[PDB]
Design a binder for these strands. Structure first.
Length: 258
DNA sequence: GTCTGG
DNA sequence: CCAGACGT
DNA sequence: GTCTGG
DNA sequence: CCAGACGT
């Protein structure tokens, strides 16, 4: 799970993230670094994607059930990394297996500080391996949706964003600069629905109960939080063209059916 | 910064 | 103890 | 075969 | 994730 779509204009994304805090107040998440939001049909690791995180990570004495939305770097850069440039990292932090997460140096420390985030996406791409061919079929995978320029605009207004369990860390560049916020997406075993595409899938949080508990490092311990991490069958997909393959291709044809 | 392997 | 990794 | 850049 | 380089 090393590609996503996140193409929505920023205000349309923000209205799709309407939530209720613990007191039942209908809110929209507050932005940090909105200028780093770069919408694209074709997001790879080392790009920025919007994530939800608890207000309490940014504001002292905050309601931990309130939400911030911020761009973060896809590919976790641990706090301790010593080189000048994030891209010199000699290990893969695009994903984080759920089974091993407590034993992994890169993920344990930040998960232990409550650095739990929710990665937003239209949906994600997976490439299917088939016996005795090097050819790979790309699929676009997304939450079931409520079933022409008027058809398109209506669908994307009423789109249910995919909400994926992530962990994030903060890194002060040694040479100097703004603190880097970076995230990994947690993986689990694929469900029956997806098993013929790929043996591994992102940890999907299905519904506002699950999203809220994962965000709320105020009231919800790591042990309680890890119980939300599992496959889901509440998932659909269709085959897409080879246009997605090259990350430089940012167009609607990326997630168009064939 | 922390932890495993030697 | 220190060296060396730290991940999919 | 492996790794960086996108 | 895949594309594309891989060197003086």
């Amino acid at each position: 799970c090393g590609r996503t779509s996140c193409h929505l204009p920023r205000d349309v994304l923000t209205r799709a993230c309407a939530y209720q805090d613990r007191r039942g107040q209908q809110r929209l998440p507050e932005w940090r670094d909105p200028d780093k939001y770069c919408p694209s049909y074709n997001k790879s690791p080392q790009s920025n994607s919007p994530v939800l995180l608890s207000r309490l990570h940014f504001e002292k004495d905050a309601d931990s059930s309130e939400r911030i939305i911020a761009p973060m770097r896809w590919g976790l850069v641990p706090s301790w990394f010593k080189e000048s440039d994030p891209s010199k990292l000699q290990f893969n932090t695009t994903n984080c297996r759920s089974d091993t997460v407590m034993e992994k140096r890169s993920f344990k420390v930040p998960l232990g500080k409550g650095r739990r985030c929710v990665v937003l996406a239209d949906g994600f791409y997976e490439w299917q391996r088939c016996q005795g061919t090097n050819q790979r079929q790309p699929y676009f995978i997304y939450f079931p949706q409520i079933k022409s320029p008027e058809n398109w605009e209506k669908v994307w207004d009423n789109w249910r964003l995919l909400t994926m369990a992530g962990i994030f860390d903060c890194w002060e560049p040694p040479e100097g600069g703004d603190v880097l916020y970076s995230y990994t997406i947690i993986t689990v075993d694929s469900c029956k629905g997806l098993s013929d595409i790929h043996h591994r899938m992102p940890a999907i949080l299905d519904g506002e109960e699950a999203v809220s508990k994962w965000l709320d490092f105020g009231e919800v311990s790591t042990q309680e939080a890890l119980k939300l991490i599992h496959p889901t069958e509440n998932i659909t997909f269709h085959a897409v063209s080879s246009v997605v393959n090259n990350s430089r291709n940012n167009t609607p044809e990326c997630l168009a059916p064939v």
